[PDB]
Design an enzyme around this catalytic site. Structure first.
Site, PDB file in Angstrom:
ATOM      1  N   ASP A 154       5.694  47.789  10.130  1.00 28.34           N
ATOM      2  CA  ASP A 154       5.893  48.487  11.399  1.00 28.34           C
ATOM      3  C   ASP A 154       7.265  48.176  11.974  1.00 28.34           C
ATOM      4  O   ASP A 154       7.460  47.095  12.540  1.00 28.34           O
ATOM      5  CB  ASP A 154       4.770  48.084  12.379  1.00 28.34           C
ATOM      6  CG  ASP A 154       4.885  48.745  13.749  1.00 28.34           C
ATOM      7  OD1 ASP A 154       5.637  49.720  13.879  1.00 28.34           O
ATOM      8  OD2 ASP A 154       4.191  48.279  14.699  1.00 28.34           O
ATOM      9  N   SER A 166      19.984  60.804  17.614  1.00 29.43           N
ATOM     10  CA  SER A 166      20.096  61.971  16.745  1.00 29.43           C
ATOM     11  C   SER A 166      21.052  62.965  17.379  1.00 29.43           C
ATOM     12  O   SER A 166      21.154  63.037  18.596  1.00 29.43           O
ATOM     13  CB  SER A 166      18.721  62.606  16.512  1.00 29.43           C
ATOM     14  OG  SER A 166      18.839  63.888  15.936  1.00 29.43           O
TER      15      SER A 166
END
EC number: 3.4.23.22
Length: 330
Positions: free
Chosen positions: A35, A199
């Site tokens: 994770d 992004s």
């Protein structure tokens, strides 16, 4: 040193991925959920409330000659999905794919919430975010990666998740045969303890690319792609009959639909998520309403590049003094 382990989807929807991890002496092999959105290595154990164990493999520290109680230490964590666990702490030898750390904090669960109990395939979590998020008290502990870093050939690990198929986590090296083209690296902020990046935009299907900064975390422990409501609306508007259902808890679509792809930007590069990756199947057995793999982050408080996005790429988690993230197509 290096390590290389295969990671395997837990079910037919890729809801999560499990990776075998050896703990203790003699080895006890547990299948853990790697994770990159958390920083605790915790396991189902011989100390876990018996009623809260249902099919998981447990760690028994008393059978390990290298296990030592970390006296006084406890832990308690809550995840973004509302699940939780807590217990005490041992140090022990932990190996992943041939890579060994001695003195790793292994957090032993005394309690786990129902969703962990209900998932017989996940024996615990191995966190790969930054150690600043580790919940061990009063002495915060380091992640497996943090502990291994200095010994690695290169201070990196990579995530190569499969779509309805096995993939790979590598430590200490970049497998140049595992991706196509070049790797595009992008800046990371560790200020929240996550692999947090920006992004450069998105496209829907064959649509034009929208340049727009989207701050988010690369999180292998989250199933879906969570993005701003504007972006998510633009995606689902291209699917006939798609709608946001409060009763279901997100966007659903007709199971008869063909989903468009979704492109996200990494600097000047582009990662394409095929439409099939965004299908998470009937909301309930036999239903003709299907659950979408792109959902709004509104009310999460952060955008999450979860498995839906990450499995479309070869992803480098670069833990150099100045950490960065790399994405390549594959």
């Amino acid at each position: 040193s290096t390590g290389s382990a295969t990671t395997t989807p837990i079910d037919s929807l890729d809801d999560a991925y499990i990776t075998p991890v050896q703990i203790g002496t003699p080895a006890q092999t547990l299948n853990l959920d790697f994770d990159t959105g958390s920083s605790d290595l915790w396991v189902f154990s011989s100390e876990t409330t018996a009623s809260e164990v249902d099919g998981q493999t447990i760690y028994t520290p008393s059978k390990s000659t290298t296990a030592k109680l970390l006296s006084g230490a406890t832990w308690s964590i809550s995840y973004g999905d509302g699940s939780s666990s807590s217990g005490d702490v041992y140090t022990d030898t932990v190996s992943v794919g041939g890579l060994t750390v001695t003195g790793q904090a292994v957090e032993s669960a005394k309690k786990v919430s129902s969703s962990f109990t209900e998932d017989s395939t996940i024996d615990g979590l191995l966190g790969l975010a930054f150690s600043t998020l580790n919940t061990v008290s009063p002495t915060q502990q380091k992640t497996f990666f943090d502990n291994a870093k200095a010994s690695l050939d290169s201070p990196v690990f990579t995530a190569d998740l499969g779509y309805h198929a096995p993939g790979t986590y590598n430590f200490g090296f970049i497998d140049t045969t595992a991706y196509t083209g070049s790797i595009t690296y992008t800046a990371v902020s560790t200020k929240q303890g996550f692999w947090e990046w920006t992004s450069t935009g998105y496209a829907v299907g064959s649509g034009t690319f929208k340049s727009t900064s989207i701050d988010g975390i690369a999180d292998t422990g989250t199933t879906l792609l969570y993005l701003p409501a504007t972006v998510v609306s633009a995606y689902w508007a291209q699917v006939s009959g798609a709608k946001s259902s409060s009763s279901v808890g997100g966007y659903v679509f007709p199971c008869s639909a063909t989903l468009p792809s979704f492109t996200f930007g990494v600097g000047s590069a582009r990662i394409v998520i095929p439409g099939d990756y965004i299908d998470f199947g009937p909301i309930s057995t036999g239903s003709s309403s299907c659950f979408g793999g792109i959902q709004s982050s509104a009310g999460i408080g952060i955008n999450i590049f979860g498995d839906v996005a990450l499995k479309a790429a070869f992803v480098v988690f670069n833990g150099a003094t100045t950490p960065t993230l790399g994405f390549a197509s594959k």
